[PDB]
Structure formats: C-alpha cells, structure tokens
Enzyme design. Structure first.
Site, PDB file in Angstrom:
ATOM      1  N   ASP A  16     -10.671 -69.711  25.134  1.00  0.00           N
ATOM      2  CA  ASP A  16     -10.362 -71.135  25.247  1.00  0.00           C
ATOM      3  C   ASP A  16     -11.606 -72.035  25.291  1.00  0.00           C
ATOM      4  N   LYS A  34     -19.515 -82.561  36.304  1.00  0.00           N
ATOM      5  CA  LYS A  34     -18.066 -82.395  36.173  1.00  0.00           C
ATOM      6  C   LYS A  34     -17.447 -81.864  37.460  1.00  0.00           C
TER       7      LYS A  34
END
Ligand SMILES: O=c1[nH]c(=O)c2ncn([C@@H]3O[C@H](COP(=O)(O)OP(=O)(O)OP(=O)(O)O)[C@@H](O)[C@H]3O)c2[nH]1
Ligand SMILES: O=c1[nH]c(=O)c2ncn([C@@H]3O[C@H](COP(=O)(O)OP(=O)(O)O)[C@@H](O)[C@H]3O)c2[nH]1
Lengths: 312, 301
Positions: B237, B109
């Site tokens: 989150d 990523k």
C-alpha cells in the site's frame, strides 16, 4: 561544550541537571516589569522517566521542582547574579561539601526541611520588598533559588545562597554567634572549627574595620534585625570569618616551593578590609545566616547589642 | 526568546518538545556505534507547572521521544544538523493534521499507534539500509518520532524530510501506486487547488511524460533497491509522490535549486517543453506482488 552532569551522587547529578534545565527554561520566559502575586505562589515541576537512554550519569527516573522561579530569578537579578553565571557555577562541575557549595566556591546549597520551605514562602514577599528597599545591601542570607529534588522516591529540599566567605581569600578562623554557648571539645579538635560565643569571649579577638566600615555595617545590621523581628523569626546567627593576609602569603609560598588581601566587593559582598591602622593585616566576612525558623523583639535587641560590641 | 507561539496548543508543545529533546541530546555524547537498546529506548518527560510560563504553554503536558539515539543518527546520516532541525521546528509555529515547519523544510505527520509499532518493527533494518546506501535513497527520511500528551490525550508524530522545495513552488502533484486496481483522482479531489492526481490522470498528458537520459539508470537502480527491500520487509500500500514545476509559470534564480537541500529534485532534459520532485511515501502499513507491479510501472515513466 557538553554538560555530562557527572557527580558522585545521583542527587548532585539531578541537582545539576535541574538547575541547568530551569535556568534555560526561565531564559525563554520574559523578564516582567513587576512581580504579580501568582509569582509568589507558583512553581515548576517536571518528571523525567527515561528508558535505555542517557543512563550513564543521570538516574533514569527523577523529578525536579523549582519554587517561585520568577521571584528567585528577580532576586538573582537584585543581587547582581547573572543566571548563566549561576547555572555555570552549579553545572560546569559538580558541587562539593547537608551542606554543599558549588565547585567555584561562589554559591552555597543547603538541604532544608519542608517546614523550612514553607517558612520561606510565608516570608518571601516581605523579603523581596526588603531586598528592593536596601538594594541588596544586607547581611541576611541571599536566596537565589529553592528546589525540591525527587530521586529514588525521596524528595529533597535545597536552598541556594551566596557563600558568605570569599571565593578567593581563604578563611583562617570561623565563628557562629547568637545563655552560655561553647563549641564541642570534639569540634574544638576539628580542622576548621566553627567556634561559638564563649570561645570568642575567652579568646577576646576583635575585628578592626574602622569607623566607615563599622558604620555601614552597623546600620545594615540594625535594619536587618528590625526586619527579622518584624517577621517574628528567632534562632538566626551571625557568621564571621577571618582571613589573615600574611598567612595567605606564607601558604602560597609553601605551595610555590613544592592582589593580596585585595578582594572584589561586587563578588565578596560580606567582606571588609581591616582598618589601615591594624595590627595584623586581616580581611573579615560577616553575615546573618540560618533565617528559616524568648521574644523575637527581645532576641532582636540582644543580638544587635552583642554584634555592636565586636567591632572598632 | 522562544515563545513557542503556535496556532494550536499541541503545536506549542511540539515546539517545546523538539527544542527540549535536542538540547538534552546535545549533552549526550555521540557513540562509536548504535547499540541494540537504542532501538528499544525512549525519553519521556512530564511538565506540570503552576502559575508559570502558562502564556503560550500548557501547565501540564507530556513529551516522549522514541529511540532518540537512533533518530539522531538518522538526522546525521541524512545530512541534517540537529540545530538546523531544531530551528526549523522552533523558530516559528509550524503550518499546514499535516504540517510543515515554518520554512517548508521538514514534514510533520500525525500518525497512529499502529503506525508507530510498525516503525519500531522496521527501525533496525531501515537504519541499516540507510547506512548501506549512504543516504542515497528514495524512501522517506525519518528524523524523529514523538508522543505528545495534552489534557490527557496522546498524539503521535513522525518527522521526515519534505519532498517539495522550501523555495520553489510546485506546479502539479501526483500520487502513484501501480495497483492492478484502478485509482483515479476524485472529482472532489480534482476540485482542490493542487490535486493529488493518481495514475489514470497522469497517463493523459505530454508534459506528464517525463524525459531523462543517464540519470534515469542510477535512479532506477536506487528505486529497485528500495522496492526490493520493501517487498523483503513485507510492506504494501505504499506510493510514489511526485511534483512538477514549470518555470515559465513561475516567471508569470528561476528553476534554480540547491540539490544539497532539495534532494529529490531533478532538472528537465533538454528535450523538454520543468523541474520534478519524486519520492516513495505511505510506507508504514504491512506483497512482493505489489513490489514488482509498482516498480515496473514506475520503471516506464
Ligand atoms: O506557605 C506556603 N506557600 C506555598 O505557596 C507553598 N508551596 C509549597 N509549600 C510547601 O511545599 C512543601 C512540601 O512540598 P509540596 O507539598 O508542595 O509538594 P506537592 O504539592 O507536589 O505534594 P507531594 O509531591 O509531596 O505529594 C510544604 O512545606 C508545603 O507547605 C508552600 N507553603
Ligand atoms: O553561606 C555560608 N557559607 C559558608 O561557607 C558556610 N559555612 C558554614 N555555614 C553555616 O554554618 C553552620 C554550619 O556549622 P557546623 O557546625 O559545621 O554544622 P552543624 O551546625 O550542622 O554541626 C550553618 O549555618 C551553615 O549553613 C556557611 N554559610
């Protein structure tokens, strides 16, 4: 299997690291049908800037530039040198001795001046064509790579050749032949003296190779000096080395208490055995050196006639 | 010969760089222990070559690997051999900026510098937790972090163990949060092939009601350890990504997988209609509030 790159000096560690790196990198680069002109103008530069990492043997910051790596790779091929052989002589252990040889005495690393590098460049294409045409049958130095190291902010130029002397047969006398030139009385009192011309004339030694070795050799020397004269190059030399086989036996015996005169021409390429009718059983190593610098044609003729004199 | 032939030039540099760093590392001995400086260290190289190897690589570029000793130790602690990792990255160009290696074994990523700074803030406690759980954990498994520079543009990347199998195709995907907030799948996101459905879409289904007996307990204990640790590290989150595989759909060995390789994978209980993959994600953004809510939601399903 680990290359520690441990040396006594950081420039030797960076040298070993850089040869390992370039040889490996080059191994992922295909072998081309022919060299293109860019290969004679190319180079590889890399800058290592590490932090709190791998400091034990390498410097934390350094740079390694390899000149015309495609050309020198092909030259290594033209000279029958396998790159993995080459790197391992350089990297399996630190070289030794600015004049250096690899731990296994198979290759020589000479630091050079920037002008030397530029001269190398002006000649490289003609050199490579000469190497093609004589299939590597030559007395000139045999260039395997040229590098710029940078360490502590100092750039360092180095050029690799085959050692002209054997990696196995020990050398018992050395001469550097090209006005009256004599070896320093201080040099004359060193361990292995690099004796000069006048010292050879006063000793009156002569190498006994016999017609067939004589002929091979003289033909390649005539072609080589004609080629050098063609590039307008002067101040080169003929390095000559003597290995007295009886003495090699004696010294191996002394070693013991506390084949002989056989050598591999694939490996020791400047080497010649003495004529079967020789007084002392001897082996000789002979090459041109110092090729990176009152007429070049005059000096061609002078050099050639003198070297023609020293044989039988 | 590794050509580093890729779809994009930065992928070529990625392959070059993982190859380079791993080879470099192979010449660095493995130390009795990690030292503190390893968590602050890095390796940078600048390649600026000219009329040479330009065919697939750039002539000028830069490659930084962060804390390579620590990340090497993580690869080991997760049972990844550097040479397998290297071959997954380098044997063929990665694929799909979100990437998997040609063999679908590892995830690459692009991340932001802020994410990188967070990663550094956590690396020692994370590594110590990975030590303590012997790698038996549901958190992401970080295997390396790098900064590419190309044309002068820097690009950050973090490589983790993929959650899905490198062999078995995944048949449904969900991304779960547990916010008191309401998260549903977009009609646009629902208009992809594999929708990343949220909690609300998952509640309405009976194959989505999963089934498991004794393994559930030890799974729950490991999920608890992870969430307690994250609440402790001040991370919010984050999510739980999950995947479903209905073997009948595959037929139209099967349902066979190697748990040594697909580590997040689980077989369905005999009281089933499937094979499921489940892990925690998005953990590089800094309450315990969220910890308890998230963990309780995942505890029921
Ligand atoms: O006739 C040539 N054809 C060439 O193709 C060629 N390539 C390099 N050189 C020589 O290189 C040496 C110093 O090194 P270099 O100036 O190349 O380093 P550089 O370009 O990175 O600059 P800097 O790092 O010293 O600041 C000098 O003898 C340059 O004349 C060449 N000479
Ligand atoms: O390929 C080679 N294999 C060798 O083993 C070797 N040994 C010496 N040489 C050359 O001989 C001169 C140094 O002689 P020197 O007098 O010791 O040094 P300097 O002339 O600077 O005082 C320079 O041309 C050296 O490159 C060798 N070349």
């Amino acid at each position: 299997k680990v290359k520690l790159f441990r040396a006594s000096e950081p420039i030797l560690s960076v040298l070993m690291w850089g040869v390992n790196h370039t040889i490996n990198e080059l191994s992922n680069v295909p072998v081309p049908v022919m060299l293109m002109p860019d290969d004679f103008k190319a180079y590889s530069k890399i800058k290592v800037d590490n932090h709190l990492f791998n400091k034990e043997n390498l410097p934390s910051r350094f740079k390694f530039k390899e000149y015309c790596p495609m050309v020198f790779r092909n030259l290594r091929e033209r000279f029958g040198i396998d790159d993995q052989d080459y790197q391992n002589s350089v990297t399996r252990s630190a070289p030794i001795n600015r004049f250096l040889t690899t731990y296994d005495r198979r290759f020589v690393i000479k630091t050079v001046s920037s002008e030397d590098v530029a001269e190398m460049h002006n000649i490289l294409k003609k050199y490579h064509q000469f190497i093609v045409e004589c299939h590597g049958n030559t007395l000139l130095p045999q260039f395997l790579g040229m590098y710029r190291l940078t360490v502590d902010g100092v750039e360092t130029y180095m050029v690799v050749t085959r050692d002209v002397f054997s990696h196995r047969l020990t050398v018992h006398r050395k001469y550097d032949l090209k006005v009256a030139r004599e070896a320093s009385d201080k040099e004359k009192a060193k361990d292995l003296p690099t004796f000069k011309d006048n010292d050879f004339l006063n000793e009156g030694q002569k190498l006994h190779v016999g017609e067939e070795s004589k002929k091979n050799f003289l033909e390649k020397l005539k072609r080589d000096v004609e080629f050098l004269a063609q590039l307008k190059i002067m101040d080169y030399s003929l390095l000559v080395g003597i290995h007295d086989v009886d003495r090699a036996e004696q010294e191996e015996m002394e070693v013991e208490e506390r084949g002989p005169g056989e050598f591999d021409p694939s490996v020791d390429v400047y080497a010649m055995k003495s004529h079967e009718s020789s007084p002392k059983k001897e082996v000789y190593f002979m090459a041109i050196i110092d090729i990176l610098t009152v007429n070049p044609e005059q000096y061609s003729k002078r050099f050639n006639e003198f070297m023609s004199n020293i044989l039988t």
